[PDB]
Amino acid sequence: NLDIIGKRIEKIKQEHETSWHYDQDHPYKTWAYHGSYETKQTASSMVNGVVRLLTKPWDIIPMVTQMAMTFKEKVDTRTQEPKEGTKKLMKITAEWLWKELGKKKTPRMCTREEFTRKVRSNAALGAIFNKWKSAREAVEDSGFWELVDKERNLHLEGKCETCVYNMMSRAIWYMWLGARFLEFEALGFLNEDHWFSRENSLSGVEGEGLHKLGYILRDVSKKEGGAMYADDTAGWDTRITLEDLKNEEMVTNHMEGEHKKLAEAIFKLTYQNKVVRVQRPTTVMDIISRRDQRGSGQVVTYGLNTFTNMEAQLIRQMEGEGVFKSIQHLTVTEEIAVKNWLVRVGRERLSRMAISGDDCVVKPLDDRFASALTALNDMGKVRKDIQQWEPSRGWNDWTQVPFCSHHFHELIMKDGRVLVVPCRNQDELIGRARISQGAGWSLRETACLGKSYAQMWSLMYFHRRDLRLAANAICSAVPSHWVPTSRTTATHEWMTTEDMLTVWNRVWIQENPWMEDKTPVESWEEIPYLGKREDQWCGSLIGLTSRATWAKNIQTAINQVRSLIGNEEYTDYMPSMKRFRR
Numbered sequence: 202n203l204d205i206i207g208k209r210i211e212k213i214k215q216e217h218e219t220s221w222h223y224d225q226d227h228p229y230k231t232w233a234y235h236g237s238y239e240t241k242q243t244a245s246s247m248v249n250g251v252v253r254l255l256t257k258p259w260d261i262i263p264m265v266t267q268m269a270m271t272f273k274e275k276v277d278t279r280t281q282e283p284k285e286g287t288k289k290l291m292k293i294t295a296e297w298l299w300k301e302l303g304k305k306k307t308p309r310m311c312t313r314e315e316f317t318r319k320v321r322s323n324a325a326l327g328a329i330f331n332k333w334k335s336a337r338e339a340v341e342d343s344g345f346w347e348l349v350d351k352e353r354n355l356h357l358e359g360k361c362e363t364c365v366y367n368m369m370s371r372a373i374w375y376m377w378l379g380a381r382f383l384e385f386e387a388l389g390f391l392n393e394d395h396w397f398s399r400e401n402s403l404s405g406v407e408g409e410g411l412h413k414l415g416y417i418l419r420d421v422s423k424k425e426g427g428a429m430y431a432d433d434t435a436g437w438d439t440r441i442t443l444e445d446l447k448n449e450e451m452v453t454n455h456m457e458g459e460h461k462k463l464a465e466a467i468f469k470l471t472y473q474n475k476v477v478r479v480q481r482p483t484t485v486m487d488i489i490s491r492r493d494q495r496g497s498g499q500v501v502t503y504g505l506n507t508f509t510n511m512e513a514q515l516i517r518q519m520e521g522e523g524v525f526k527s528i529q530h531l532t533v534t535e536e537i538a539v540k541n542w543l544v545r546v547g548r549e550r551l552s553r554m555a556i557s558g559d560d561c562v563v564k565p566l567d568d569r570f571a572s573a574l575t576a577l578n579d580m581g582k583v584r585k586d587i588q589q590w591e592p593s594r595g596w597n598d599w600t601q602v603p604f605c606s607h608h609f610h611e612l613i614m615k616d617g618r619v620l621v622v623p624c625r626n627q628d629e630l631i632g633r634a635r636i637s638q639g640a641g642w643s644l645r646e647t648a649c650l651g652k653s654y655a656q657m658w659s660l661m662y663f664h665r666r667d668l669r670l671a672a673n674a675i676c677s678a679v680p681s682h683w684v685p686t687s688r689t690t691a692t693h694e695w696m697t698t699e700d701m702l703t704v705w706n707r708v709w710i711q712e713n714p715w716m717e718d719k720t721p722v723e724s725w726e727e728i729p730y731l732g733k734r735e736d737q738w739c740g741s742l743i744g745l746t747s748r749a750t751w752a753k754n755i756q757t758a759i760n761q762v763r764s765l766i767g768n769e770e771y772t773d774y775m776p777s778m779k780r781f782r783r
């Protein structure tokens with residue numbers, strides 16, 4: 202308690218000594234409250250005019266238009282302590298899993314240079330604005346690194362002064378750039394050295410790319426076993442127990458020297474003890490603390506969520522296979538039974554899964570898994586949108602399974618070769634491409650963001666008639682040499698000024714390990730679409746009068762946007778499509 206968090210609390214108390222008051226009408230029940238102080242401030246979603254002017258038919262579709270308009274009673278709930286049997290299963294599995302992930306990898310510190318390079322090419326390091334303007338300026342100033350140095354030596358001494366979260370089914374925990382650096386230095390290796398790649402972790406998909414995920418799910422489907430299960434957890438980050446954070450910290454058992462001490466301090470001082478500041482309109486700032494739940498940088502959050510989800514799903518697989526009888530207590534005989542299962546079949550059981558943070562697909566040995574719920578519920582990983590003891594419903598066809606907000610189609614090229622393509626309802630894709638975040642967008646910056654969406658559609662969603670057409674229109678409307686941009690940056694192969702047919706060939710043919718015949722495609726007309734009825738099922742407007750008028754008159758829409766941008770060099774990409782090819 203206050204020995205570890207008191208120093209951070211003390212320091213904030215004094216900077217607002219004028220305003221400090223133990224408010225008696227504080228809304229917190231599960232968060233430990235400390236005090237309040239005076240503040241006054243808040244970032245809505247803005248429309249991308251380039252994408253909207255080239256998608257006119259969607260101006261009258263509420264599922265698109267409503268996306269641009271506009272639970273903290275889940276952060277303030279509690280999780281119960283797991284039973285002794287559950288605690289044993291988790292400790293044994295976590296010990297085994299860190300060793301497997303560690304066999305071909307070496308834990309190491311990430312560098313100031315690595316951190317600096319990340320800030321100098323816009324990575325979302327969930328930092329706050331103050332003594333320097335942006336992250337880019339702090340990183341160039343030697344005074345910043347001296348503050349970093351002070352905190353760093355405090356961590357080596359087992360104490361913390363400035364690593365405090367700022368809060369804002371979503372929740373982001375911004376920290377000052379310094380606290381973020383010390384997290385990256387100690388635990389960045391998990392992401393930087395690809396500990397959750399599929400090659401290294403067998404279940405993971407880190408670095409895989411949306412063009413690989415369907416092929417990975419089809420490979421899982423080829424295993425003998427039962428249905429494919431894809432159960433979503435209700436509020437995963439809020440269900441991370443103190444036992445989970447202790448099993449995650451066991452990665453430090455694999456470290457040495459300074460690194461070991463710096464990592465032990467991140468886990469002890471910032472993860473297993475948290476200090477948070479939250480805006481309340483009654484506008485004050487509340488200083489609250491708690492020991493459990495996930496509150497880390499988004500990239501460390503992804504790797505540890507993947508770790509703890511792999512652990513939870515192996516234990517659910519053990520329960521289905523009858524490796525243990527009850528979560529109340531494991532016998533030392535069962536303990537040897539659990540380790541032996543892991544040693545003999547653990548790697549095979551990991552390969553039956555695709556796990557992306559809180560998102561999983563599992564093809565178990567048989568359907569006993571569906572009703573194997575005692576460990577999953579007792580670990581706190583309660584399933585969304587199903588009663589606690591109702592058996593999971595599985596998917597009989599890998600093309601139906603949801604994963605990473607997509608489903609996947611098997612698409613046969615005119616030449617016989619097989620593509621496995623990503624897909625989701627087309628209203629979601631169009632509605633997201635019509636939105637920007639933040640202020641001060643020039644017309645050129647807005648155009649270059651529209652071009653990023655268009656080139657993503659050409660590479661990932663070429664099989665959707667409306668998106669191939671709208672992608673060609675946007676790329677025709679934006680100057681040919683203008684570089685696609687994002688402010689917030691899987692593999693993003695569409696982020697390039699290379700010809701999109703050349704990139705398509707590289708991604709789907711040359712580098713595709715599921716494609717034996719490497720014969721290049723010579724034109725976009727060789728690249729297939731879904732069936733027309735399937736395209737409509739997944740939200741196409743093909744068949745509507747509004748869509749036919751848009752497609753027929755597309756050069757008029759392209760010319761409207763070119764006239765706004767002005768006298769620039771443009772390319773016509775529409776004749777890459779059969780219907781505009783004379």
Ligand SMILES: O=C1CCN(c2ccccn2)CC1
Binds near residue numbers: 545
């Ligand atoms: O190779 C192995 C997989 C099967 N396993 C067990 C152990 C107890 C109960 C069910 N299966 C033994 C080890």
Ligand SMILES: [Zn+2]
Binds near residue numbers: 352356361363
């Ligand atoms: Zn600290």
Ligand SMILES: [Zn+2]
Binds near residue numbers: 610624625
């Ligand atoms: Zn689809």
